[PDB]
RNA sequence: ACGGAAACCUUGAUUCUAACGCUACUUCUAAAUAAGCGUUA
């Protein structure tokens, strides 16, 4: 059965978040450590690469049953969802992450 | 059988050290617990 399930949620920060972007890329920021933003709305975002990497690192301490010096000698559980470039049968995972844009700018205003 | 696959803008950092809400200034100035004894008898 070919289906696609979509875990949707609202990530509410409970402390200040600093994902951090390049100084000249996310606009020229006067501050020394700017956060990553949307190139048009100039609102902070949570890129899907951030969530994917942090989730893979966290589940790499639980569902690995061993240690890995690279994200290639990983468990089948992590490879099947996030992907492994050197494995033929998991060259792309079953999880697709998305950028998380600001959703409550009205409420903040 | 998508110039594509895999990749945390990440690790370590105390908005901290020093500093008397302090110096000067009389609750003070005059003041008898005292005055009046009528008229009748």
Automatic annotation (TrEMBL):
Family of this protein: Belongs to the CRISPR-associated Csm3 family.
Protein name: CRISPR system Cms endoribonuclease Csm3
Residues shown, of full length: 2 to 110 of 220
């Amino acid at each position: 059965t070919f289906a696609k399930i979509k875990f949707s949620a609202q990530i509410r920060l409970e402390t200040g978040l600093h994902i951090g972007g390049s100084d000249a890329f996310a606009a020229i920021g006067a501050i020394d450590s700017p956060v990553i933003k949307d190139p048009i709305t100039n609102l902070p975002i949570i890129p899907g690469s951030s969530l994917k990497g942090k989730m893979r690192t966290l589940l790499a301490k639980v569902y690995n049953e061993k240690v890995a010096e690279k994200p290639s000698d990983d468990s089948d559980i992590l490879s099947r969802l996030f992907g492994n470039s050197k494995d033929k049968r998991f060259k792309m995972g079953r999880l697709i992450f998305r950028d998380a844009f600001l959703s409550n700018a009205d409420e903040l205003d």
